[PDB]
Amino acid sequence: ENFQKVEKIGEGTYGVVYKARNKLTGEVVALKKIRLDSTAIREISLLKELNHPNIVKLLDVIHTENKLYLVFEFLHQDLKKFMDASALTGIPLPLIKSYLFQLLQGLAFCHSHRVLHRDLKPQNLLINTEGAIKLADFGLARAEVVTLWYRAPEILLGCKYYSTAVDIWSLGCIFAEMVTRRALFPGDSEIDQLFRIFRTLGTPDEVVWPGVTSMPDYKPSFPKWARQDFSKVVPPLDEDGRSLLSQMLHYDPNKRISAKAALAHPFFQDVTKPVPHLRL
């Protein structure tokens, strides 16, 4: 039967995204087809078990021959395209606050289950018309240039243990990008990424980050830059928002604020759930 309607939605990176509608019932699901060349299925399938309103509902993971079909709820847009559409006006700060609040909710849930995203970027965050935003694309990498701008420094320095703090770093970068309408650290290589971080937050030392000089890719020949004023880096963000961001961007992953602790930050205490200012 040709009782459904399947249509290409676009994109690249990992795969092609499709929109399927059930004509008789009206039901709609999204599909992502991604080619291969079993560790991926294990990590991708765990998201069927993680049910949270700020995590995309993964309906199934289907391994057929040399392809992988991901079936999930159909959300209308991703945060990167919404940021582009909002570039002229900016996203209203109540909406930025709500989105950040909701994303910290989803990461708190993930991190309480000792589940990490590890590859957070705006392209992985989906929004609907009712004001919700959801984490998506867990584990897809298991099946680098694009992900670089949001990578925590301990990863760039070759650390082998990824804590939950790597997701908080990435979200901090997305927070700054929503506020300023420009990526915070747009590196074109691993070393350019590190140096862009160093020039803004100061070149890290053993005082601010115990153990940093013993990481695999640390080099004493790193140039020594001084810390910059956050009021210059994310204007015109308010003092509360700046306090939160700086705790999200501590160098030492143990000092970086947790998702739970961040939810209690004074920045969030007038948070609401407004609908998107655009037709998104």
Binding site: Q4, Y18, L31, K33, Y69
Partner: peptide, 17 residues
């Protein structure tokens, strides 16, 4: 019974040539 979208995957597989 399987979900309705089993046919949608069948259709994409068919038209991926």
């Amino acid at each position: 019974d399987p979900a309705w979208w089993v046919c949608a995957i069948a259709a994409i597989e068919c038209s991926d040539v």
